[PDB]
Symmetry: D2
Subunit: 349 residues, 4 copies
């Protein structure tokens, strides 16, 4: 029950409004809920829809009338009109038309770019051009100048993933505009850092984000395959049966690519069904290849190549593989783990 609804009490309460006081006893339980109950909801975006809307955006929105910001933000139906896939993350399909470019900027927000379709596009990160192609994870960590340049008559689309929504709500955003379109097969960063177990004596200082600008498909495919081959041979390797998986990491540290964002890739042998997990914080997945399904909150949704979905904080989820099922993944887990808020429930266990 509340306090007696008296004239004295309504006066007290008129004073509260005047004085910028809100009394705890008027509040609803869910200011401190039994467990996390997100405003954001589990949602799926069909690739064939995203691709159709992106080609269309490309016709209608050329450069000089919107075309240098041609990204279609996946907006969670529960997040009140904000361009947020979850409370922490932004996820958009950038569509780069034939021969298009962008100038250099920087910002505190951390970003990656995961190539879906296309080749011959370079993103230049602090002056170092990083060739882009299908299955490549690129990084443009906080405060690194990045611009891009298409070298071809062909469109490219990629997932444009950022901690924009965390950064906006917590007030950490900074942004600056900056000052030959070279096309090396491999960036300097990779030429220094993509040799396994080796570290340059000039790179002895640890960094906060990874210095690897592209994690190329090749390597991601080979690791996932070797984990499956090791399963066939009775050797331990997969996280769970028929579930191969790698985390993309900062080689100076062995930790996450950037402070706010985790990236991973999972490959599921056909028939594999994962155990249901409740994880604190939000994750987004994208079907790289194959066919299968997700369950979220008990509800199964069938998935096709390119489809993207979000699991908010604590929503129970699992994946199931009809064919062999490749999935790119990202999450706000390094925020929850850095701050000791992370909890995990797994069904068996």
């Amino acid at each position: 029950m509340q306090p007696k609804d008296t004239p004295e009490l309504r006066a007290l309460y008129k004073s509260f409004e005047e004085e910028s006081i809100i009394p705890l006893w008027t509040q609803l339980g869910d200011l401190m809920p039994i467990h996390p109950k997100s405003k954001a909801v589990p949602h799926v975006w069909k690739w064939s829809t995203l691709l159709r809307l992106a080609r269309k955006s490309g016709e209608l929105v050329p450069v000089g009338r919107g075309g240098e910001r041609r990204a279609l933000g996946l907006a969670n139906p529960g997040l009140g009109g904000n361009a947020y896939i979850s409370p922490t993350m932004w996820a958009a399909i950038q569509y780069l038309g034939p021969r298009e470019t962008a100038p250099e900027h920087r910002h505190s927000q951390n970003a990656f770019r995961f190539v879906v379709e296309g080749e011959g596009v370079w993103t230049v990160v602090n002056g170092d051009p990083v060739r882009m192609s299908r299955g490549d994870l690129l990084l443009t960590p906080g405060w690194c100048f990045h611009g891009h340049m298409n070298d071809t008559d062909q469109p490219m689309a990629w997932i444009d993933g950022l901690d924009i929504p965390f950064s906006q709500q917590m007030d950490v955003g900074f942004f600056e505009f900056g000052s030959d379109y070279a096309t090396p097969n491999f960036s300097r960063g990779e030429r220094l850092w993509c040799h396994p177990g080796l570290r340059p004596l000039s790179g002895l200082q640890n960094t906060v984000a990874s210095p690897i600008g592209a994690y190329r498909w090749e390597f991601t495919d080979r690791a996932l395959t070797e984990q499956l081959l090791l399963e066939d041979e009775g050797q331990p390797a997969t996280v769970a049966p028929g579930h191969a998986a790698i985390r993309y990491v900062n080689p100076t540290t062995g930790g996450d690519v950037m402070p706010t964002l985790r990236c991973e890739f999972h490959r599921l042998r056909a028939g594999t069904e994962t155990a249901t997990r409740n994880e604190v914080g939000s994750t987004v997945f994208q079907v790289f290849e194959g066919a299968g399904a997700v369950v979220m909150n008990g509800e199964t949704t069938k998935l096709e190549k390119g489809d993207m979905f979000v699991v908010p904080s604590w929503v129970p989820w699992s994946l199931q593989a009809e064919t062999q099922f490749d999935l790119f993944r990202f999450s706000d887990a390094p925020i929850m783990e850095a701050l000791s808020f992370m909890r995990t429930k797994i069904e068996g266990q």
Copy 2:
């Protein structure tokens, strides 16, 4: 400019709404601002107002009709009706009437309690009673059962500070209800941990929050005084001239009391004016003792004993001491520092 306002474009845009797409090019700059520009605003609450409203709340709201949650949340005028002092923090004046109690609960949200007026109240934290008195900082870190019990015919008020607003927006909240009202002068925690430079062989494992349940006035006063005395003697000690200051810390680690919240105490020799600072993230201060002023965004506000104010992300601020000026402080700085978002501008420097 935007794309040509054509029927085709309005169709594209009707599809976006249907499909939960929001295009980056429609967005306003301030999704990624030049620097942080908070929705929250600098604001001051006058203690004499908070005290008047608290006594009143005590008459009108007894136990069984709201009285076990008698906290008056300082609500930022810019934060749209949420009981938030800033986007990350909650700050309330809890008013405990004569002989009142509360039962044990726990929650993932981290909390402290800074005693303003009163004595003879124990908060019991995982079964360990912590006597409360004026100038004491108490902790009830995430997931620690806490309840309280007043032992006296006298009211007590304290600042009830939590990371409630961070926890709600990011979805990390959990909460549980729990299962003799002993009155020791000192808690076990303090009996183990409040011996300087000494650590118990049974407490060799590092912890995420501090195990010190009360940081008593005595010690805080003595440290601040010794720093001033050391200044008089030509020895280095103060952070800036006439500006003595301590940070409350976790002795297992030397870091912050809890993962999301920093606490500090500042004592200003009369006449001292601090250099203007822009700091990422938000802080709240409370005048423990003395008289002086704050400048925030260029605007001076005079301050009296008990007055509380908030400096959102990047608002330029300084303090000025007319008499000798004691101030309790807290902030979301460990979140910004844990995630490499922290930046600091200082005027001289």
Copy 3:
């Protein structure tokens, strides 16, 4: 068996000597032993002997003819004439006569000074005078200028403990000579750092050694007592029953006082017998107060106030308390733990 003792083989072997080759197959097992088997042996030094030899040294060795280096190194009978208590540590009884002084030097070797008998002696550490008295642990960490000055007509003796033997064998030794004999009751360091759970905003940077120059008896006694009182009350605290114990720590970090040396203090309720332990690396203990015994390798030795003993790597040991038994302790454990060589066997467990 060896290779056939042939003229060819003796030639091979004459070549080895010539060429600075020593073949593994000629070596004895104990270049890589089943477990650690120290050259050093368990040994006890009787205080009444150390005191007698120290007074004597004081008569015969005044200043200008040896008296500024009046330390009597405990030399392990197994360590071949080196002034080593163990392979890693040096432990000596420094005897300071009436009014004597020493000038400032520094060195990479880490050092502490544990006051046994005496008062009114200051050691000055980087210009900061640290009053010395009975039961105080003082530090003079690596590379800190230290000199001392006696202020009284009375001798003082203290344990002078260093990582001299580690430093000599591994080649890390550096040494420099340096450039009013003030007598403050408390050093600056302590005035800044001996307030429990508080840290100065000017001391926000972590350090490698502790900045606390004296860990005074007072605090050590109070902690040990509170742990015993907590045992009487059914509260967890002691490491083992009737075994109270603290580790001296670096407050910036919560770790060991200095990188190579651990210090601790143990208080045993009468009747308490500890469980036998095999620990990697060496430790030295000194009976501060009480009467009791040690077992080392199965052999019991009775102990009196001041007596000192060493347990080399892996020697099984325990302590037994006839009266209430106070013991200062140091070891090379931070070297073994830093390098993952530490192992521990305990009898029950």
Copy 4:
């Protein structure tokens, strides 16, 4: 001067011997030297000598009469007959004859094996066979079962480098004997861990030694080459001009391969002369390929393929490259750095 040589003093001194006391004032300065002055001396071993003595050892010392321990320890002429290359390190040429094997053991001492000549030998490390070939660095970290098996009619030689001398002097040595000779091209470890910037979700826990069992030539060559190519292009990369260099690292951590031992590889463009360095602790180098020289203490020695040399603590050294000069390197630097004893002087700087 000493104390007066009196009968009383000789008595005092007879008591010291009796009582296991050695007085500091009798000691020589160099118990705490101005800077490190090693017992060990700079020394070179000519490969053509090591190879000749190894073939010979192979004839004279077959299996069953010494042949399973056919390693020729490089013994520093200054270290009094111990099989030590420096006070911290052991370095030997293991010579494995046609078809020979060894059974599994383990020990706390950390070890690597750097292949010089040969192929078709597997070392099996905790049951995982690691193919060996020229230029490969293999690890067998502390406490990992390792045995080997030759698969060929051909001898192989490798550098057999351990922290044997540190382990013996400090007393940390443990050793155990253990319980199909499979020949995979690549070990499991490498199949999991040698994909750049990728980490298996089953390997999320940090380790103390690297889990990479072989750092193959291929990768080491490619990194060194790419650093030189990057120099040609005006991009920063080399540690110094014409001086390319990588450190072998633990990918879970980015730190050193094992806690006591650092490994590195340097490639010098012809004509390159390095700046003179004094580094705390000892290092050993082996000419993998090319021709050039070392200066140590001012004395130049010409070097050929395979030649090995040691620079004790603080000996000033530099390398000079007549042709293009490839050098494997190891040191006790992680011990000095872990314990804050490391110091570095460089000539320019």
